[PDB]
Write an enzyme that holds these catalytic residues in place. Structure first.
Site, PDB file in Angstrom:
ATOM      1  N   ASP A   1      -3.447   2.182   0.673  1.00  0.00           N
ATOM      2  CA  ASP A   1      -3.497   0.963   1.349  1.00  0.00           C
ATOM      3  C   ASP A   1      -3.319   0.057   0.292  1.00  0.00           C
ATOM      4  O   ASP A   1      -2.520  -0.978   0.649  1.00  0.00           O
ATOM      5  CB  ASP A   1      -4.878   0.840   1.820  1.00  0.00           C
TER       6      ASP A   1
ATOM      7  N   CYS B   1       9.956   7.275   7.365  1.00  0.00           N
ATOM      8  CA  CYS B   1       8.723   6.668   7.442  1.00  0.00           C
ATOM      9  C   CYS B   1       8.693   5.635   8.944  1.00  0.00           C
ATOM     10  O   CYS B   1       9.771   5.692   9.269  1.00  0.00           O
ATOM     11  CB  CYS B   1       8.317   5.715   6.339  1.00  0.00           C
ATOM     12  N   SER B   2       7.812   5.207   9.393  1.00  0.00           N
ATOM     13  CA  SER B   2       7.649   4.312  10.620  1.00  0.00           C
ATOM     14  C   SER B   2       8.748   3.699  10.999  1.00  0.00           C
ATOM     15  O   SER B   2       9.655   4.184  11.994  1.00  0.00           O
ATOM     16  CB  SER B   2       6.372   3.425  10.452  1.00  0.00           C
TER      17      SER B   2
ATOM     18  N   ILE C   1      12.578   1.830   6.602  1.00  0.00           N
ATOM     19  CA  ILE C   1      12.817   0.805   5.598  1.00  0.00           C
ATOM     20  C   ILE C   1      11.780   0.640   4.505  1.00  0.00           C
ATOM     21  O   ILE C   1      12.148   0.654   3.192  1.00  0.00           O
ATOM     22  CB  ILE C   1      13.177  -0.420   6.359  1.00  0.00           C
TER      23      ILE C   1
ATOM     24  N   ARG D   1       8.296   2.392   3.378  1.00  0.00           N
ATOM     25  CA  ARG D   1       8.134   3.565   2.262  1.00  0.00           C
ATOM     26  C   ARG D   1       9.175   4.158   2.102  1.00  0.00           C
ATOM     27  O   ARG D   1       9.577   4.712   0.848  1.00  0.00           O
ATOM     28  CB  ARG D   1       6.973   4.208   3.108  1.00  0.00           C
TER      29      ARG D   1
ATOM     30  N   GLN E   1      10.156  -3.222   2.228  1.00  0.00           N
ATOM     31  CA  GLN E   1       9.788  -4.420   3.383  1.00  0.00           C
ATOM     32  C   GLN E   1       8.922  -5.344   2.616  1.00  0.00           C
ATOM     33  O   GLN E   1       8.955  -6.493   3.120  1.00  0.00           O
ATOM     34  CB  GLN E   1       9.259  -3.714   4.446  1.00  0.00           C
TER      35      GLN E   1
END
Length: 282
Positions: A182, A217-218, A221, A223, A261
Site C-alpha cells: 500500500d 495487473c488491473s 499499466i 504495477r 501510472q
C-alpha cells in the site's frame, strides 16, 4: 526521448528525493490512446477502463477464431520491447475480466507464452482480476489448461501448467505476486526484486528467442510497468553499470500508454534499483 543516466551514488540519493522524482515523472507524457481508435460495437465490454486502451502500433491482435471480426480479434494488450529495444520481450495486458478469460488463454496459446506474471493481491480478486486458472483442469475455447503443481513461496506462488490443444502440449509457468505494498517504502522492495530475478532466470531457461512473457495487473499499466521497468533496468545495471529509469519509462510509454501510472510507483522502481545496486556491489 528523455534520459537520465544514474551512477550508483546518484541512484541511491534520487530514490530518496520525492520532490525531484515527481518533477521528472510528471514531465513524461502518458501517451494514452484516443478512444476513437476502437469504434467497434461491443468493445467497451472487453476493457476494464474506457481510457486505458492498447496503442494501435503495438497491439496484440487475436487470430483465432475469426480474424475478419474486429471484436473477436480484440484484446487489451500490447507487445513491449525489452532491454536494448529487443522486440516482443513482454506483453502487457489487463487482468482478465469474466468476458475475456477465454480471449486471454487464446493470446497465451497464440503467442507461445512460457511465463505469466500476475501482480494482484489476494484481497483484490473481486476488483482487479478474475481468477482465470482452474483448481485442476479447465478448457476455454479449445485450450485445455491443467495445473500440475502449486508452489507457494513467501514472495510468490508459482503454478506449473500444461497447455494442450489438439495434439500439441506446452508448458507454462504462472507467477502470482501478492505482496504489492500500500505504501511504497524501501522496506517493501525486496519481494519485488526477488520476483524480477526469479522471472529473469526462468526466462533464460527457455533458451534462445524466448516467446513473449505476459505481465498483468488491473489495467495492465501501473504495477505491470513497474515490473517491466525494473526487469529492464536490472539488465542495464548488470551490462552497463548504470540505470536509466527515465529513458526506460519513456520507451515503455511508447509501447503502451500509461506504463508506470503513479509517482509512488516511479519512486518504488528507484527504491528497487537502489537495493539491487547495493546487492550487486557486495
Amino acid at each position: 526521448s528523455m534520459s537520465r543516466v544514474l551512477q550508483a551514488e546518484e541512484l541511491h540519493e534520487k530514490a530518496l528525493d520525492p520532490f525531484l522524482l515527481q518533477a521528472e515523472f510528471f514531465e513524461i507524457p502518458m501517451n494514452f490512446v484516443d478512444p476513437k481508435e476502437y469504434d467497434i460495437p461491443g468493445l467497451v465490454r472487453k476493457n476494464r477502463y474506457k481510457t486505458i486502451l492498447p496503442n494501435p502500433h503495438s497491439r496484440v491482435c487475436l487470430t483465432s477464431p475469426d480474424p475478419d471480426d474486429p471484436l473477436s480479434s480484440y484484446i487489451n494488450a500490447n507487445y513491449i520491447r525489452g532491454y536494448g529495444g529487443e522486440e516482443k520481450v513482454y506483453i502487457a495486458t489487463q487482468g482478465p475480466i469474466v468476458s475475456t478469460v477465454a480471449d486471454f488463454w487464446r493470446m497465451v496459446w497464440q503467442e507461445h507464452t512460457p511465463i505469466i506474471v500476475m501482480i494482484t493481491n489476494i484481497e483484490e480478486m473481486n476488483e482487479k482480476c478474475t481468477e482465470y486458472w482452474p483448481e485442476e483442469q479447465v478448457a476455454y475455447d479449445g485450450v485445455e489448461i491443467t495445473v500440475q503443481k502449486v508452489i507457494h513461496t513467501e514472495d510468490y506462488r508459482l503454478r506449473l501448467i500444461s497447455l494442450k490443444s489438439g495434439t500439441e502440449e506446452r508448458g507454462l509457468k504462472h507467477y502470482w505476486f501478492t505482496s504489492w505494498p500500500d505504501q511504497k517504502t524501501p522496506d517493501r522492495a525486496p519481494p519485488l526484486l526477488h520476483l524480477v530475478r526469479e522471472v529473469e532466470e526462468a526466462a533464460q531457461q527457455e533458451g534462445p528467442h524466448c516467446a513473449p512473457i505476459i505481465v498483468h495487473c488491473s489495467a495492465g499499466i501501473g504495477r505491470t510497468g513497474c515490473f517491466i521497468a525494473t526487469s529492464i533496468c536490472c539488465q542495464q545495471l548488470r551490462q552497463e553499470g548504470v540505470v536509466d529509469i527515465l529513458k526506460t519509462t519513456c520507451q515503455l510509454r511508447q509501447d503502451r500508454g500509461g506504463m508506470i501510472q503513479t509517482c509512488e510507483q516511479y519512486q518504488f522502481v528507484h527504491h528497487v534499483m537502489s537495493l539491487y545496486e547495493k546487492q550487486l556491489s557486495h
